[PDB]
């Protein structure tokens, strides 16, 4: 269209099909169905929602407005999954 490009791509579509494909290949999957993408996108969205909620609560308890790395480390440590190499 000459008037405008009219691009409304959603932000959740940032993780594209080859990214999920590489993740599955790293996980050890040979052949991948076509419906895996939406499912893993929803799973990633739920996980990020939980972790971000925990980190936001942690950083709001300290009255700070910047989400630091230690906040995410504590949020991950709360859910029984400790991450190393960041603090």
């Amino acid at each position: 269209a000459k008037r405008h490009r009219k691009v409304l791509r959603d932000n959740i579509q940032g993780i594209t099909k080859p990214a999920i494909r590489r993740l599955a290949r790293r996980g050890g999957v040979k052949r991948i169905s076509g419906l895996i993408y939406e499912e893993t996108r929803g799973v990633l969205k739920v996980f990020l929602e939980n972790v971000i909620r925990d980190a936001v609560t942690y950083t709001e308890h300290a009255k700070r407005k910047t989400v630091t790395a230690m906040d995410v480390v504590y949020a991950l440590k709360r859910q029984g999954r400790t991450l190393y190499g960041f603090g």
Binding site: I15, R26, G28, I32, L44, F47, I52, A69, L83
Partner: protein
């Protein structure tokens, strides 16, 4: 010169399991993190280390879930992961 399906898949599997590179681009994941955090609180800043740790944790969880669903699919005598495979993996792990 074309190859029969399955061999390039195995080559890519070997390449990715050997290396430790990030399989998700930085800017899309950062934008998604910011969008998801907008729902909890507006006008929030983010350090690069924070989004990097988020990306690392997400990739680790995703590859663990992919290994689990691959095992579940192999249990079904198949070589194709399906949505129900991931659902069963999440139900057995308890993080549903």
């Amino acid at each position: 010169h074309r190859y029969r399906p399955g061999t390039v898949a195995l080559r890519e599997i070997r390449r990715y399991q050997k290396s430790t590179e990030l399989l998700i681009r930085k800017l899309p994941f950062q934008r998604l993190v910011r969008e998801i955090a907008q729902d909890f609180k507006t006008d929030l800043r983010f350090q690069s280390s924070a989004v990097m740790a988020l990306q690392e944790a997400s990739e680790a969880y995703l590859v663990a879930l992919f290994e689990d669903t691959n095992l579940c699919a192999i249990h079904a005598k198949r070589v194709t992961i399906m949505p129900k495979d991931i659902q069963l993996a999440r139900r057995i792990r308890g993080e549903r």
